[PDB]
Amino acid sequence: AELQDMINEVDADGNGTIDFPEFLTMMARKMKDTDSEEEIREAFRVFDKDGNGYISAAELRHVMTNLG
């Protein structure tokens, strides 16, 4: 399945990837956990496949449940 549709549902502003503000906002959207930019930034490099400082849908699967 193309995770592109998930990319489109996670995309808030149209950069096609989650940014620090977006990740935090989509997170806190209903569930609010940790908000320390260090930890959140650590997540960005962990979640992403390329660790390019952003969390995309495909990247989500890499880190989350699937192989990326």
Does 48 interact with Ca ion (rule: CB under 5 A)? yes
Residue from 42, 52, 53, 66 in contact with Ca ion (CB under 5 A): 52
Do residues 56 and 7 touch, judged by C-beta distance below 8 A?
Answer: yes
Residue among 6 and 19 whose Cβ is closer to Ca ion: 19
Residue from 5, 37, 42, 50 in contact with Ca ion (CB under 5 A): 50
Q: Which structure tokens are listed for 7?
A: 């990319």
SS3 18: strand
Q: What are phi and psi of 6, to 5 degrees?
A: -70, -35
Q: Which spans of this chain sit near Ca ion (rule: CB under 5 A)?
A: 13, 15, 19, 22, 48-50, 52, 59
